[PDB]
Structure formats: C-alpha cells, structure tokens
Amino acid sequence: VRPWSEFRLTPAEAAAAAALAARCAQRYDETDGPEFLLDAPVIAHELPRRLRTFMARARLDAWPHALVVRGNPVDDAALGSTPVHWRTARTPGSRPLSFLLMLYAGLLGDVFGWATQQDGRVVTDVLPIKGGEHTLVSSSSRQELGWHTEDAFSPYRADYVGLLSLRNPDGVATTLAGVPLDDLDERTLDVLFQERFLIRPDDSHLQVNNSTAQQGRVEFEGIAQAADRPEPVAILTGHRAAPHLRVDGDFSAPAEGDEEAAAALGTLRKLIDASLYELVLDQGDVAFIDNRRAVHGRRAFQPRYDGRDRWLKRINITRDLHRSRKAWAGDSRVLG
Ligand SMILES: NC(=[NH2+])NCCC[C@H](N)C(=O)O
Ligand SMILES: [Fe+2]
C-alpha cells in the first residue's frame, strides 16, 4: 500500500512513448514554442492506451499524493553529462526526454512557466549547481530542500508539478507529505482555514537566480510586492474532510502578532515533519505531484560534480490556464 498511484510501462509501451517523443523532437524546434505548446495535448492522444487510461483514472482518485510512471529508458551515453547550470541544460541528449515529459503532462493539464524563474522556460531543470549547495532553491544539495507547496505565494501556482528523472545514480529521495488530518484537532484545523498567514515568494524568483536580460523584467516587481507586503491568506481550503494545502516550510509565517495563527502553523510544521516520507525517482521515472494535496522537497545529498549528478526535467501544470489570466505576462504560458 502506497500513498501515491503507480504505473509501470511495459518495454513495448515505453518504446512507443519514446518513439512518439522522438518524432516530436524531429518536427518541432522547441518544447516551449507556441506550436508545440498548443499541439502537445493532441499529440499525447497517440500515447499507449493503457497509460492514457491510468492517467485519466488516477487524476480522478481522491487519495494519491502523486501519479508515478516508471520504466522509461534513458541511455546515459546518449544523454551526455549533467550540465553545470540550468542555463546550458537544453542539451541535445536531453531533448527527446523533455518532449516526452511535455506529452505526459498534456494528459493532465495546461503547462506554463514563470517570467521570474529560469528565464521563463516551461520545461525547467533541477540539478546541483556548484557554490549553491546551501541555498533554498532546487539547485541545492548539501542542505535539504525543505517541504513546500510549489509557488505557495501565488494564486496562479500549479495544480501538478511534473518531474522526469534523467539520472539519479545514488538514489536521492524526493520527500512528500499530505495534510495530517489524523492528528489535527478541530480548533487548529479551524484556524488554518482562516486568512491569518503570510506566504512570501521563494528565492527561485529572485533576479540573481535568473540571467542578465529582460527575460522577465517587469514581473520581478510583482515578486517584490509579494515579498514586502504579503496579503494574509489561508493555509487550508476546501473540504474539511479532505483539505487543500498551501504552505512553505521556509517562507510561511503567521500574520503579524497573531499568536493563535502561530500556534496552528507551528503545530502543522511538527505534524508534517513527523509524516514526511520518501519517494526515490530512479532514472526514467516520472512523477506528477499533486500540488494541492501534498507538499514536497528533497533530501540532503553530497553532490558529485563529475558529470553524473542527479538531474530532473520539471514542468508546472494547471487544470485551467484561464485562472491565471491576470498574470499572463509573456503570453498565457509565462506568468507574472
Ligand atoms: N526551500 C524552499 N521552500 N524552496 C522552494 C523551491 C521551489 C522553487 N521552484 C525551486 O525550484 O527552487
Ligand atoms: Fe518543489
């Protein structure tokens, strides 16, 4: 029994999916281009039927924290060495696998990026960056990436976060936790449903973690506003018996002087820490983390810096792009 839903491709199914992604990589210039963004959800209809059935059904189940698809081949020789930075990470060896993640994502929803994160890319990279071991962003290593809702600060945050493991030779775990409903008392639960908490943007939206450009110039103003003047929001929303979750372990606080909110948040921290569990994304595994049901993070690890570090491709997915239309910055697909 597992708190996520799991699908394992047969070799033939895995090969057919890989072949489809390879065809897309031949026919489109880029994953993030207007053309593939629009076409991917229709091309995805050609994926193996058993996989399409799993994705359609598992998305509608009440319980899972993630949807995990195992068994995509990745040839390390063809893939090439892990890049030293996300900037240079669009390597030819990783291209077909970026197309594959996009195709799988297109079965779940609408993909998007942020003007203020990795130069507005839709398919982003997770890999350790030398000098950045003890930071609060996903290019950390030696410091654990604390649990979080992705883009917790933003009402336009993803419904699902998709991750494809290109390599993970030493088996570093992703961490997950749901709402600790078996332990939250009714008074604490009540307070977490109230608009008594502050959630600021995480460090991935800072200018210094993007390139020199205007690849998102004005959108950094909105990040500054969310950082300087956060509006009080609720941590829990929806059904009391199955709440949705909005929290960041390192970027959340109580509203100013609100000691009851503080107690509720401190209790939630304790209960999430106590229930956090591990999911190891082995090479070729894809996970879609439900960013409303669960928080996620990543265990501390010693980086290699020898060309074979852990490397994921990542994508933000929403069930409805039109929810974020106020933030439609560089078209509908790059928010801020
Ligand atoms: N410690 C944290 N809460 N970090 C948030 C990290 C999330 C961000 N999208 C990143 O990839 O870096
Ligand atoms: Fe994350």
Swiss-Prot record:
Residue spans crossing the bilayer: 97-115
Name of the protein this chain belongs to: Alpha-ketoglutarate-dependent L-arginine hydroxylase
Family: Belongs to the clavaminate synthase family.
Binding, 2-oxoglutarate: T174, R310, R314
Required co-factors: Fe cation
Keywords in alphabetical order: Antibiotic biosynthesis, Iron, Membrane, Metal-binding, Oxidoreductase, Transmembrane, Transmembrane helix
Source species of the chain: Streptomyces vinaceus
Record function comment: Involved in the biosynthesis of capreomycidine, an unusual amino acid used by non-ribosomal peptide synthases (NRPS) to make the tuberactinomycin class of peptide antibiotics such as viomycin and capreomycin. Catalyzes the stereospecific hydroxylation of the C3 of (2S)-arginine to generate (3S)-hydroxy-(2S)-arginine. Usually clavaminic acid synthase-like oxygenases catalyze the formation of threo diastereomers, however VioC produces the erythro diastereomer of beta-carbon-hydroxylated L-arginine.
Residues annotated to bind Fe cation: H148, E150, H296
Keyword field contains tRNA processing: no
EC number: 1.14.11.41
GO biological process: antibiotic biosynthetic process
Recorded metabolic or biological pathway in which this protein acts: Antibiotic biosynthesis
UniProt gene name: vioC
Binding positions (L-arginine): L136, V137, S138, D248, G249, D250, R314
Main location: membrane
Classification via Pfam families: TauD
MF terms (GO), sorted A to Z: 2-oxoglutarate, L-arginine oxygenase (succinate-forming) activity; 2-oxoglutarate-dependent dioxygenase activity; iron ion binding
Membrane topology annotation: Single-pass membrane protein
CC annotations in GO: membrane
